[PDB]
Design a protein around this ligand. Structure first.
Ligand code: AKG
Ligand code: AKG
Ligand code: CO
Ligand code: FE2
Ligand code: FE2
Lengths: 289, 285
């Protein structure tokens, strides 16, 4: 395409370059971060969840939509491949650690599945600043407090509606009403990852195919520990929590974390002690640390 | 010189609200009955009577040993948990104050005791705990409210809280003189309420009589902000003996930031946290 496209990088790519891509272009792609077997076992875990008949009670998001609406909340609690493998991907966290360098500690606000079936229209262009509305008022220069991480679980094509990203649009004052051709396509294979900076204007593609195969995507939101996690993993059984690594525990809110100075004490604590100490939390990788 | 306006506990909320935008702070006179003040004080006395613990202390270890401090009083002081935390007047103020941001809860509630011979605090804005606040524009929906409970009297001598009126409209804290501020002189049972961005400081105790100034600070934040103190390790029995309002304040229920957040926050399995937990409450139908 005539317009400059989304840079696609190998898993082992340089971190300074990814970080500078995020500030200049606002987005980039990692190629084959997740092995195909990982991707497929994740998909089967999700298949199980979606196969579950609709429950009797209230569902806060689902009840707002038609019954054909496909959605799996907080995948870490029901998809071990995500909890144990995807969530603690070292490349992802290296990016996060560079990205959140000014704001301090980050954790996982949400990780959920979205399936877009044939005949569904594109999303309107938007900035991912609705969940925590205060973000709408954050100046561009301020230390970023949220990172969008997008996992294609089916192929992302021009036809089925690969994610549309407008490069450099995070420097815009408002989203406005940009035309579709201002954006480029995040065409990907399962195992690739799209990483999108805060304030970058984007939109879901919408599935124009007619063969029945639906587009499947898991969206993960990594936020500053200043921001309340949309999904709370506090009801995870202790056995499951302790089977995770320390990084895993920190991501899911089971540990005291640290916003950058001038916060010098930290956050998410109790009795002036670390939450994991009060809980006496064990971890799969705590003898080695 | 313009002073801190003192309002009756039953005063109109619309006036309190207009004060918070105009002066940036105000005082409620005698909000807490004497029995409340005294039982709260006795509960805190119990807590401070516990010997210095052996392990790490995240805040206490950052300051001198003479620094007196009791964290997350709601878990150890029933008077605060059952009476003070859910004060209807406080929440009338909050619901007006946080209308643009949506739901609010309790980030921290702790005791500080300032002994004789201690210097004044430097002037500051209470935006260090959540640094992102430092970049929030003046016009943006406020996301934090400082609520200050004097448990001993606040006098000129013992170091009543120094508040600079209208300073929330300043671009920077700068280096203001002490004589730019007015004094939050109060009796136990009064409440000092301070807007976000209002420059202020602890007074510093000029007395030599030994009575240390005692204050409980409660920070009510938008549910967008992660609570500094997490009350997730409270026993279920303690949680379920509380009112719904109390549970919402201590992070045990799903909450709702203002639109365009339309689902809410602090939820799980696409359900309300309290439903998944099947949480009972003292005043729930
Ligand atoms: O469907 C997509 O690829 C993007 C979805 C998205 O950006 C959102 O839901 O905020
Ligand atoms: O001690 C006081 O009266 C006020 C303290 C204060 O503003 C603070 O510690 O942030
Ligand atoms: Co002067
Ligand atoms: Fe989005
Ligand atoms: Fe303060």
């Amino acid at each position: 395409d005539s317009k400059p496209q989304l840079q696609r990088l190998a898993a082992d790519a340089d971190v300074d370059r990814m970080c500078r891509l995020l500030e200049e272009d606002g987005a980039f792609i990692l190629k084959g971060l997740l092995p195909f077997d990982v991707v497929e076992s994740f998909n089967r875990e999700l298949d199980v969840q979606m196969a579950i008949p609709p429950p009797k009670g209230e569902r806060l998001l689902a009840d707002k939509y038609p019954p054909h609406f496909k959605y799996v909340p907080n995948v870490a609690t029901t998809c071990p491949t995500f909890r144990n493998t995807v969530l603690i991907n070292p490349v992802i966290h290296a990016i996060c650690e560079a990205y959140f360098q000014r704001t301090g500690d980050y954790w996982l606000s949400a990780a959920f599945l979205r399936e877009i079936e044939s005949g569904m229209p594109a999303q309107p262009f938007h900035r991912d600043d609705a969940t925590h509305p205060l973000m709408h008022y954050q100046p561009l220069e301020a230390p970023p407090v949220s990172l969008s991480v997008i996992f294609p679980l089916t192929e992302f094509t021009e036809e089925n509606g690969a994610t549309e990203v407008i490069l450099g649009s995070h420097r815009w004052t408002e989203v406005g009403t940009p035309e579709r051709d201002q954006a480029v396509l995040a065409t990907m294979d399962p195992g690739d990852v799209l990483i999108v900076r805060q304030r970058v204007v984007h939109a879901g593609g919408g599935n124009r195919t007619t063969a029945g195969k639906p587009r499947r995507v898991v969206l993960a939101y990594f936020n500053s520990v200043q921001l309340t996690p949309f999904e709370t993993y506090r009801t995870m059984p202790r056995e499951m929590v302790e089977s995770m690594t320390v990084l895993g525990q920190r991501m899911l809110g089971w540990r005291t974390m640290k916003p950058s100075d001038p916060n010098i004490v930290g956050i998410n604590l109790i009795d002036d002690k670390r939450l994991e100490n009060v809980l006496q939390l064990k971890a799969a990788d705590s003898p080695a640390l």
